[PDB]
């Protein structure tokens, strides 16, 4: 097994290329959980692999994507083999507020998981300090796939 | 060979916090941190606790989030023994008159552990949010995180 760390902005070109190549070369499934997802090269890699027949699921943060014209959620909602939904975080202990869905995770087939600090935005891949980790570690992948299904429980239609 | 430990929050939020807190607390040499938002007082106390034992701690905070924020831990940790705090803004946007952010949430412990993932160091993240937190001892990842950490440290500015 291999971990491939990308430290942005230093490695921002390689990081975006790695994420786009991982989504585009999927054979079966792409499962994504993302807080913010505005980036149009990445939405086109999704659109491209869904057109090859791959099943894509995308969980977006509810508060920040349910009515947000810069989110790709509107753009991808209609798309063949592509299921998008919205997830709120848990009821808080502080106030009457709900948490956020702040993950930035992509799971490709049974083969690769991407995680780290980067939202899917031009800002993240051009202007920010960030970290993106790609891993083929099977135990990592299995746990991520298991909890992704669990999350899907609580997610709702766009 | 290495061990990835993934925590998926909120399901594993207490195990996640406890892993991170234990990783910092038991450091024997150094703690290197780059964090976007850091308001969680128990994690700050854990930093104080280990800095009190003579471990060197360095913390890069996001500049806009931390330069003037009473809920930030930067003020609480600034002049603490063995503790270096500083601020870092991102790059200028190619077609805008604004700068990026320092959005990493990373802790490097000795040469032995790196913690990375989505979670800001807040009660919000450890109590209410979906997040992921990954612990690894993979030495290639650790060396690389250390190398760029040093480069980051040369761009950060005083608090
Ligand atoms: Cl974030």
Residue numbers in the entry:
A (entry chain B): -1 to 156
B (entry chain A): -2 to 156
Manuscript text:
Hp0323 (NucT) encodes a nuclease from Helicobacter pylori belonging to the endonuclease PLD sub-family. So far, NucT has been implicated both in the process of natural transformation and in the purine salvage pathway. The family is defined by the “HxK(x)4D(x)6GSxN” sequence signature where the histidine is proposed to act in all PLD enzymes as a nucleophile in a phosphodiester bond cleavage.
Twelve identical copies of NucT are present in the asymmetric unit of the crystal (rmsd ranged from 0,7413 to 0,8494 Å taken monomer A to the 11 others), forming 6 identical dimers (rmsd from 0,5647 to 0,6868 Å) with a 2-fold rotational symmetry axis. The active site of NucT and of its homologues is carried by the loops that link its seven-stranded β-sheet, itself surrounded on one side by 5 α-helices and on the other side by one long α-helix. The HxK(x)4D(x)6GSxN signature of NucT is perfectly superimposable with the catalytic centers of Nuc and Zucchini. The active site, twinned by the dimerization, is nested in the hollow of its dimer interface, surrounded by two small helices and long loops (orange in Fig 5A). While the short loops present in Nuc and Zuc are acidic (pI 4.2 and 5.7 respectively), the extra loop in NucT carries a strong positive charge, with a local pI close to 10. Thus, the NucT loop might contribute to attract the DNA into the electrostatic groove of the dimer, resulting in the higher affinity for the ssDNA when compared to Zuc.
